[PDB]
Symmetry: C4
Subunit: 439 residues, 4 copies
């Protein structure tokens, strides 16, 4: 008979998961833009002599510079309601860093016993972090200027305070304004004891609801999420039933025999995985929007992976035809040899990664970590960022000519061996499968 | 018999459309250079503390900074005839922003009822933009300093004024100088209420003729445009006649039968489209040069598309030969399979675009919008801007290691799957067509 | 018999031309480094508020700024022997810009009759450049401060002076120090009348010999040049004799018949061209080193082209073998089809270049000129600088969404059509020739 | 019989060499980070008006600037214990630059007899460097301000001093803190006599042990190194025995005959080389960690090359199979033709390198040296950094249009000839070997 009803379900599933992902992405982009702009404004307000683009190189180098930076941060905290453009409120902290009735916590962190005398080549140190904090309470509209840093024993200096604001961007998109609480941490890190103390500002936003959100004249999203859950549960149920029928037929055919073992439809397995991921992501999204969960990364990862998986199934629909079927069977045929060559080239690639790390870590910016070395080599294989690597090595040709020559040999050998042979063999293998399927 | 007369016409057509496009492009480049330099000078004159390259990051962060920026803009407007190098004239506005007899309009835009009290987690807002403007009239050779911004309710602040200048570059190329009117808008945008207010300056130029343009000792372009119109109308007429003959023969052959359906020459269809586009663009160009139409984008698009289409027809001329014919028939044969594989790879590409957007929007500069994600993935497929993507993800490895691992898996899977398989299959398909045509 | 004597000659020829090119390149690099450092020092000395990297954006925007820049340049010229680190001497000019007994010439250039009144939309201009110059003579160890610029009629302002120095770098490489004369031009260009006046400094060095160059204890190069000339003249003579024998045999074989027409050895033609280029370049080099000719570009081009041509002949030596011969005959076979496809793809490429120029000139930095458009498209075809193009177009998505959509369609169509089809067909054609030669 | 014991040994060898390389790399990265941060802090402390990123363009241009830079460096040296954040100790030098009891050495270096009079075009110079030094001793908590530079005869000015510090980062990783001695050299180089004097700061660190390193409560690395040495000596012994057996069988089979000559296993040769490299690197590492050898480059190169070689042997393990064996035999077959084509393309590549150097050295940043030209051409071949080259040439189109046209022809010819033909032939050759192995 005729029954395309099951095929109909999965297209509506693709449609609804795509719309849900688009809506969630738009909302999340708005919230992330708000957070990022608030953080940039915080850096410009609280970091003395800060300019855009100077984030990793922003550091202090003199005792006077460090004192001025700390004092400027505290004074700008005290003058925020007068100078700021953002309508921020104090919190009168009651947590761990802040005592009962203080907004800002200025804390040193230094060794308990530290005596460094480089001139006698002697020292005695007891590694144990002693923390002394000064508490500052904001006026509603004193001794932090007497701070002594103990530079020889210093490990880091941190400033902790929180700010409450109302997100007014949500007036657009017809959302109810959200109550944000930004936890701001300014770190003066001296863990390297190298004379250079980096200064960074990091924020953590805690979104909550507002007690009295009355907005003049102001469930579709929740009902759409419920609809997505329903459609994905129906898809899960039908795929599970189909797998049960498949296993029943597998036992019935095995009872006659008296990759051949498997007789399961992988498309249904992929559909089941996508349905489970979508249901989990939708529940997580309902929670996040209800403001009882923040957890933004996991939900986004689940929803994106599910959307990708459901968009893979259009290949399953295309296999029902013939020319598309042969075009996909060519890749299916070519895959095993591609993996077998991947192993043989991956052992060489790993050896080159280790050698490049161990040799060019001290002298090359792109070779500092193993993951960075892997990314650099992968981009080199595909023809990207080659002259920058060569010029970075060339900028140190006068010093360690041995290292420069080794870098030349290393880079030339790697690029030649991989680009001119490995990729050519990949192309050769896949053309072979194309010919096999046309024969 | 011998009659290459029709073939002769299209080569002269290609020649004339190419010359016309070159002339129009030269003139438009001159005008665009003038506009751009005027806008850059305006930014340097009116934006306080502005430097080249700081266009997207240029913003205010304190109330004093905003006040100084606004006051500096107004004062530089008032001192323009004394300080400027560009011989600008005032307009004494009479439009919508400006009252009868005012040159500069300084306007706030804020909510009618706005009360934000983040410290009680309460607020009441009536979303409706109230606009109060201060009018400034230029001396011919007062209370704008009393402006209060209402920062909590503020949405944006804008400055509107117009400037009249004479384009003296047209003395070169033997053109009569043009009368330019630049409408200048300086926007202080606080729509995000994030404490950071971007400052931008945009200009809109209205070109008109000058009442008494007497230039010492001072129709070729118009006559050349007329000639182009004539040649393209002749080409249109001959192509239409040829299509009529083709349809007549199609009916005559159909009356004997008693992709087979189509018997039309696609080259003639392309020629007809190019002729129509050229005639429309030439009329639009005559208007633009007569100064009764500005509309620069549409005319340029029409002329460029027509020029590209007429340059395609040289392929038609090359098909008349044999080796060129087989080289073009190879591509003709390879096209259908290329489109069929394009669909199968495009579904995966769309799924990866959606997943990349939804996951890496919050953390990656190149993944903010769907079009940007598509461009990033397309450049990744072709081997461009790979290490920058990897390093942008690496700059956030310490925070959200789950997101970093997902980004690694996502990027590696995408690049491997597309570069190593999809492009290889494209090459394999086109080599197959080459072999088929040589057999 | 055995006679490899002629083959021996060309290897010594390759050796000597390579050594000569290396020596000339080293000397020219030294001289160019000296000139460039002198020019950079001149910019830092004479351009007010100049910083490294601000060369194209360095401009004046106010009348006070222009006055200060001009006055600072003149004062720094007057204080050069006191402030400079470079031991420069004055010239007391006697040329065209400078009157008899003046070192610095400050010259305006403005229209003879210029009246611009933008506010009445009227003007009368007589295009004719009137030049008034102020002459400044340097003290040996007055009214330039009264300069009035006539800003409305101004076209450009230029400062001309010359400086004499002694090149002491040539003490290294055991050369006799050279007497340099730098002609310095500082241009304040107002040809666009846009309110922005670019400021640039250009130098032209005239190298001469020093009258009394006595250096303590201080012909190989000249003799080596003579040797190169001798070897290239012998090679020319033998190649000409071989061509004469070839033509004699061509007539003798034609007298029996009673690409077949040509029976000449192309390697000998290439050798003759290389010999002529080397002799011309060597004479030019002897002149340049004798200091009677500067003309550095022509000699370098001749020598480099000759060196490349002589390094091509190693292919001729490799053809004498068999496997190298088949590897070169594969390319020889593949060339004609490669050119025939080049024409078919070049017509499309030209059409796309014209369309891209005409549409994206006003809005894209990389599309301003036709040559720039061609370079951009060529780099796009090979997989370079794609995301930068896409992001440059994206930075203007809010304005002219029609232009943004057209740019998206244009870029995607071009990249797909060329990268996925044209390059694939190139690879397909060359694999075909490989197969033909192996069969 | 069954004896996989020898095969077992090499996997444990790969494991131990990989772990040893990882540990050594981590330690070396920590030490290099400490050195780099100390050097950056030194530049910020001692270079007047120094900013991050201005390393190659940092230079002096006036006599007052040079005096201020030198005096600021000396004064910052004198005020270091008061202003610095790094707990540095003086050394009271007793070496060659420093007299007995001086910490800082300020030394000019100028010609013995130097008279440059550019205005008479005469000069007399005796090239011989005279050095006069001023010794400064640090107070323990005078006439350097009277320094005269002799600018006309000046060659360079250098400042020498040393600083002792204690590395406290080693408290992490449970290492005993190290005693560092940084030798700091500040060079004011006037070797070009061009009016621009570059200023650079270089450091050389001498690591030693600390006399009394008492750290509260504080051999695995040494024992692991010993274990690696033992395993690599066993591997060397077995490989040598196997080679002895191979040679014995070679003589026994040669005594019957009465690439055929060689009958040796190349894998064993590679293993022997890797074992020797690992033993040498491990002894060198033991020395370096014992602090009696610094020599960091040689040990890292040896260890990295050995690790790469041992990771190649997994290919040997994969050859024991069949599909991996054919995938590796395809590359083995394709290699000879790849080398033969490499020679033919390398002669052209060398000719293009020479021509590009000789012509575009004066005008292109990427063409200054032969190695830089080679890297630029290699990156161009692989599709990287093409538009930057084209734009660098375009930035000088107005001057030397002949050079611009030559650069256009050169770049287009090179890119077309190599990318469109050489790489296509490489792909064609390797596909041929794939077909041969499948047949």
């Amino acid at each position: 008979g005729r029954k395309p009803c099951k095929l109909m379900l999965q297209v509506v599933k693709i449609l609804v998961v795509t719309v849900q992902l688009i809506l969630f992405g738009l909302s999340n982009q708005l919230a992330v833009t708000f957070r990022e702009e608030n953080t940039i404004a915080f850096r410009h307000l609280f970091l003395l002599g800060y300019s855009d683009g100077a984030d990793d190189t922003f550091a202090a180098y003199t005792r006077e510079q460090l004192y001025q930076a700390i004092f400027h941060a505290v004074d700008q905290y005290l003058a925020l309601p007068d100078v700021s453009l953002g309508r921020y409120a104090y919190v009168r902290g009651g947590g761990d860093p802040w005592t009962n009735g203080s907004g800002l916590a200025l804390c040193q962190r230094y060794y308990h016993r530290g005596h460094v005398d480089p001139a006698n080549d002697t020292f005695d140190i007891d590694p144990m972090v002693v923390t002394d904090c000064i508490q500052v309470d904001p006026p509603e509209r004193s001794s932090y200027k007497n701070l002594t840093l103990k530079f020889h024993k210093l490990v880091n200096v941190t400033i902790h305070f929180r700010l409450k604001t109302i997100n007014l961007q949500s007036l657009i998109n017809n959302e109810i304004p959200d109550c944000y609480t930004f936890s701001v941490l300014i770190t003066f890190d001296n863990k390297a004891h190298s004379g250079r103390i980096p200064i960074s500002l990091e924020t953590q936003a805690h979104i909550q609801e507002c007690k009295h959100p009355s907005v003049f004249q102001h469930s579709f999203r929740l009902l759409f999420d419920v609809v997505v859950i329903l459609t994905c549960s129906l898809s899960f149920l039908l795929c599970a039933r189909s797998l049960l029928r498949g296993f029943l037929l597998q036992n019935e055919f095995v009872g006659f025999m008296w990759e051949r073992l498997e007789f399961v439809n992988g498309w249904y397995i992929l559909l089941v995985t996508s349905d489970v991921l979508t249901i989990s992501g939708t529940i997580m999204k309902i929670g996040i929007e209800a403001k009882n969960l923040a957890s933004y990364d996991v939900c986004s990862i689940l929803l994106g992976t599910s959307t990708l998986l459901v968009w893979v199934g259009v290949i399953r629909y295309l296999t029902f035809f013939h020319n598309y079927n042969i075009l996909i069977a060519t890749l299916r045929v070519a895959l095993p040899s591609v993996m077998r060559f991947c192993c043989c080239a991956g052992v060489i690639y790993l050896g080159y990664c280790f050698c490049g790390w161990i040799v060019l870590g001290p002298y090359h910016v792109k070779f500092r970590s193993l993951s960075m070395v892997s990314e650099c080599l992968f981009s080199l294989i595909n023809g990207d960022d080659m002259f920058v690597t060569f010029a970075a090595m060339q900028a140190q040709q006068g010093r360690s000519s041995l290292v420069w020559l080794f870098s030349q040999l290393y880079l030339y050998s790697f690029i030649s061996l991989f680009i001119y042979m490995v990729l050519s063999l990949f192309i050769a293998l896949i053309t072979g499968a194309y010919d096999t399927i046309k024969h």
